[PDB]
Amino acid sequence: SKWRSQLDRFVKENQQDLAALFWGLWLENGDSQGTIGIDLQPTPHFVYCPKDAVEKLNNNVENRLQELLGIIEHNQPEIEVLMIGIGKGEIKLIQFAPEPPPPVCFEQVGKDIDGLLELLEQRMSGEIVV
């Protein structure tokens, strides 16, 4: 209805803070917890999507998402922010190369993972509606 354009606008308006969160979490976890997602329901919040979970989703949608598995495997986290947007029975790829790159975003924003999670979830609350 409106969540795709609302999510897209939120990402474009917050690339630097999203990149900082992406890199902070990379420093903490690598890919050990899976891929970062934004779950829009019941309120927008960050999740980790284990590889096994993404495979099950792709199988249940008859491989319509096969390219997503490859995008995840090949992501270069020093350059590319990667996130899975989770709407109502629909997912949206978030992949962008910010300026400056994610490690510099994390250093320049100067906020820890907690503060990034909090500020970004507050910013999404009420602006992305499913």
């Binding site: 899976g34 997602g37 960050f46 980790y48 284990p50 096994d52 907690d114 999670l117 909090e118």
Partner: peptide
């Protein structure tokens, strides 16, 4: 799918 993902929570300001 949503049942298989894990919330990323702040540690929080612990008292």
């Amino acid at each position: 799918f949503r049942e298989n993902v894990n919330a990323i929570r702040p540690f929080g300001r612990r008292p």
